[PDB]
Copies of this chain bind each other. A is one copy, B any other.
C-alpha cells in the first residue's frame, strides 16, 4: 500500500462505534439517553471482540500457517490503537456525564463517598437484600475457577490480608438478581437523588461479608471480568480452496477459542498471577488491565431518576391505516387490493404478527412457509406457526440455527415446531439463510392465491422497535411466484433455478448488481442521466466497491448511506470524485437496505436483506425485491430523499475516518428519523 484504495472493515467498524459515542457526547440528546449510549457503545465493543476481532485473529492464523504477505500487525496495532484512544474519550464522557447528572440532582457515588448515615443504611440494606445472593468463592490450590466461573460476569476478586498472609476469594456481582443501581437515602436536603453501583456496595460491605469466618488486618477488592471468543463458525464460511486442502494443525489452531480476562489496574501482581494459573491463560489468551467497572453495557438500562426531560419523547409506532379500512375484512383483502410497504419502527410490527396469526386459523389458508434467523424470546411467530400446524395448514419453517448470537435459541425453536407437525428445514453447515421471507398460500374461490412478505430486517419483535426496516406485503404474482421458488430453492438447491425479478444470493446477486452498475456506466458515457443510490449497513465487497469506483470514474452519481463498515473511500481524485458517502447514527439503528438505479430515467428500486459484503453475495441466501408498484417506489424515494437531506445526525465518510458532521448550508435543518416519522404520520391520516 502507498495510497490506501480501500479501508479495513474493522477500522471502519471502529469509526462506526465512534459515531455511537458521538451520540453520548451530543448535548442535543437527552441526558439519560446519552448515558445509555455509553451502554450501547460498550456492548457494541464487547460484540466487536467476541466476533469481528475473533474472526480476524483466525484470518491471520490461517494466513500465517503457510505464510502471510499482508501486514496483519499494522492492523492490530491500529485497532488496539483506536480502541485505547476511544477508551480515553469514554472516561472523559463518563465523568463529564456524571457531573451533568449532579447538576440535574442525580448523584452516582461510590463507597468512599457515603454519609456516615447512608453507610448504616447500606449495611442494613445489604443483609436484608444482598447477602443472600453474595457467597464468597474461596480460591484454594485445588479450586478451579476455570469451570464454574461465569462468562462475562463481573467478579470482585478479594484479597484477605492477615499479617504477611494473603488469601483470595471471588465475589460474583449478581447483576442478574438485583438492580445494578440502588437508590440511597438523601443525606440532608430533599434535593438529592443519590445512587450507588452494586459493585461498590460490595466494596463497602466487604467486612460484613468476611468478618464472620475470617481473621484479617485488611480486605482489598479488585474487579474482573472473563470473556470467551465466539465459536469459530463465521471463518469457515470462506475457506474454499483453503479448507479443501487445509491442514490438521490449522483446524486445531483455528477452532481453539481463546479466553480474555480484564481486571482492575491495581490488582496486585500476585493475585493476577493466581487468576492466570486458574484460568489456564496460554499464549493466545489475553490479560488486560482496565478500570474499576466492567460491563458498562448495563448502562443501556440506566434508570431515569429525574424528569422526562432526561429521556427522548416516545415516537408511537403507527398503524398502517390501510389495514383498518372497513372495506377490508382481513389482512388479505388489504394486501390483494394494493401492495403494502411498512417502514419500522415508524410503523408497528404488529401488522405482520396479526397477519401470521390470522393465517394460522383462516380456514382458507393451506400453507405457510417462513424464515427464522433471529426471533424474539418465545416468538409469537413460533407460536402461530405451531397453531397453524395444529389447524392442519402445511407449515414449513426454515430456521437459521447458524445465526450470530440468537443461534442456540433457534435450536430449541425446533423440538416443539417438529413435534407440532411443522416441517422444519435447517441451514446447511456454512451457508446462512438471511432472507426475511414468508409465504402464505390460500384459496380464494377456487384459485390458490399467494401472499408474500419480503423484508430487510428479521421477524424480531423488540428489534422491530429499535431498527429501521421495510416489510413488503404483496399478492403480486410476479413476485409471489419467485418467493415460492426461493423456498423450493432452499429445500432443493440441486435443481437449477432462475429468477427474473428477485435478486437471490448466491444465485443472482453479483451478476445482477454488476449488470445494473454497468448499465448506469453505459448510460453516463452516452450522456444519459444516471445514478446509483445505496442504503446499506455495510459496504465491503471488493468487486462491488471497484464497480462503484468504475461508475464514479465513468461519470455516474453515486450516493451512499452506509451506517456501519464502509471500505469504499469517497472523493479520491480520479477514482471516486462522484461518490458522496454519509452515515446516519441516531435514536433508531438504521437497518434497512435499498438499491436505487436511475436506469435512464425509469428508476429501479430494490429493498434488500443483503449488505454489500462478500458473504452476502456469494456465501448466503439473501433476497432483494424490486418495487413494482410505482406508489411504493415513490414512497421509498421520498424517504431516501429525507435521509440524504439530514443535517443533524448525518456524518461524512472520508479516508481520515474523521466522522465530521455534514454542515448544513442555508438548507433546512433536517433530522431524518424525525422527518421520516412526520412523513409516515403524514401518510396515516384519515382518508
Chain A interface (Cβ < 8 Å from any Cβ of B): 131-132, 135-138, 140, 142-143, 148, 169, 211-214, 329-330, 353, 357-358, 360-364, 380, 383-384, 386-387, 390-392, 420
Contacts and interface: CB of A to CB of B under 8 A. Distances in A.
Nearest to A361: B136
A619 to B, nearest CB: 37
A384 B212 contact: no
Nearest to A136: B361
A140 B213 contact: no
Contact of A362 (B148, B213, B364, B380): B213
Contact of A390 (B137, B360, B391): B137
A392 B142 CA distance: 8
Nearest to A442: B213
Nearest to A128: B350
A131 B361 CA distance: 13
30 contacts: A131-B357, A132-B353, A132-B380, A135-B357, A135-B383, A135-B384, A135-B387, A136-B361, A136-B391, A137-B361, A137-B387, A137-B391, A138-B363, A138-B392, A142-B392, A143-B390, A143-B391, A148-B390, A148-B420, A169-B361, A211-B329, A212-B329, A212-B330, A212-B362, A213-B329, A213-B330, A213-B358, A213-B363, A213-B364, A214-B363
A169 B391 CA distance: 10
Q: How many copies does the complex hold?
A: 2
Given A138-B391, A138-B392, 13 more contacts: A135-B357, A135-B360, A137-B361, A137-B390, A137-B391, A140-B391, A148-B386, A148-B420, A212-B329, A213-B330, A213-B358, A213-B363, A213-B364
B358 A212 contact: yes
Nearest to A139: B391
A243 to B, nearest CB: 34
A273 B632 CA distance: 52
Nearest to A364: B213
B135 A361 contact: yes
Contacts of A211: 329
Contacts of A330: 212-213
Nearest to A127: B354
Top 7 A-B residue pairs of the complex, sorted by shortest distance between their CB atoms: A135-B387, A136-B361, A213-B362, A212-B330, A138-B391, A148-B390, A135-B357
A391 to B, nearest CB: 5
Contacts of A353: 132
Nearest to A177: B378
A144 B161 CA distance: 68
Contact of A138 (B131, B136, B361, B386): B361
Contacts of A148: 386, 390, 420
Contacts of A363: 138, 213-214
A140 B213 CA distance: 68
A386 B420 CA distance: 37
A178 to B, nearest CB: 13
A173 to B, nearest CB: 15
Contact of A140 (B212, B386, B392): B392
A352 to B, nearest CB: 12
A392 B143 contact: yes
A126 to B, nearest CB: 13
Nearest to A143: B392
A384 B134 CA distance: 10
A242 B103 CA distance: 82
A355 to B, nearest CB: 11
Contacts of A169: 361
A360 B135 CA distance: 8
A353 B211 CA distance: 19
Nearest to A386: B148
A390 B140 CA distance: 10
A326 to B, nearest CB: 12
Nearest to A357: B135
Name which of A140, A212, A357, A360 has the most chain B CB atoms within 10 A of its CB.
A212
A176 to B, nearest CB: 11
